[PDB]
Amino acid sequence: MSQEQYTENLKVIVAEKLAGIPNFNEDIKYVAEYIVLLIVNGGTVESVVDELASLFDSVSRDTLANVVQTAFFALEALQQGESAENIVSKIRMMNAQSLGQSDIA
Numbered sequence: 001m002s003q004e005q006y007t008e009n010l011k012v013i014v015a016e017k018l019a020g021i022p023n024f025n026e027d028i029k030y031v032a033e034y035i036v037l038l039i040v041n042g043g044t045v046e047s048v049v050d051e052l053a054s055l056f057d058s059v060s061r062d063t064l065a066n067v068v069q070t071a072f073f074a075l076e077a078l079q080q081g082e083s084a085e086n087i088v089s090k091i092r093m094m095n096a097q098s099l100g101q102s103d104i105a
Contacts (some may be wrong), residue, residue: 002040003040006036006040006075006078007033007036007037007040008084009074009078009082009083009084010036010039010040010071010074010075010078010084011032011033011036011084012084012085012087012088013070013071013074013077013078013084013087014032014035014036014039014067014070014071014074015028015029015032015088015091016070016087016088016090016091017066017067017069017070018031018032018035018067019091019094019095020091020094021059021063021066021067023059023063024059024063027056031052031056031067032067034051034052034055035048035052035067035068035071036071038051038052038068039068039071039072039075043071043072043075045065045068045069045072048068048071049061049064049065049068052064052067052068
């Protein structure tokens with residue numbers, strides 16, 4: 001392979017925004033892989049937003065640009081030394097609240 005360690009760490013940060021979007025319930029883990037693939041190709045929000053909009057043109061362009069923006073910042077944080085598993089802990093708690101009904105007293 002060429003850049004998988006960055007794709008595995010970037011895929012976690014990319015999912016943090018896709019899983020957080022309120023209009024993103026299905027195709028959320030598979031959509032981050034294509035976002036990282038565009039980031040690995042070069043990292044151009046214009047070409048990365050136009051490529052994601054061509055396949056995902058149902059949600060407002062701002063929602064797609066929001067996930068590409070967090071992947072660009074993640075590339076700079078990953079190059080210095082950041083952790084992606086810690087972000088999943090916040091998504092697991094936020095994702096459980098979205099589907100956590102009939103669980104109170």
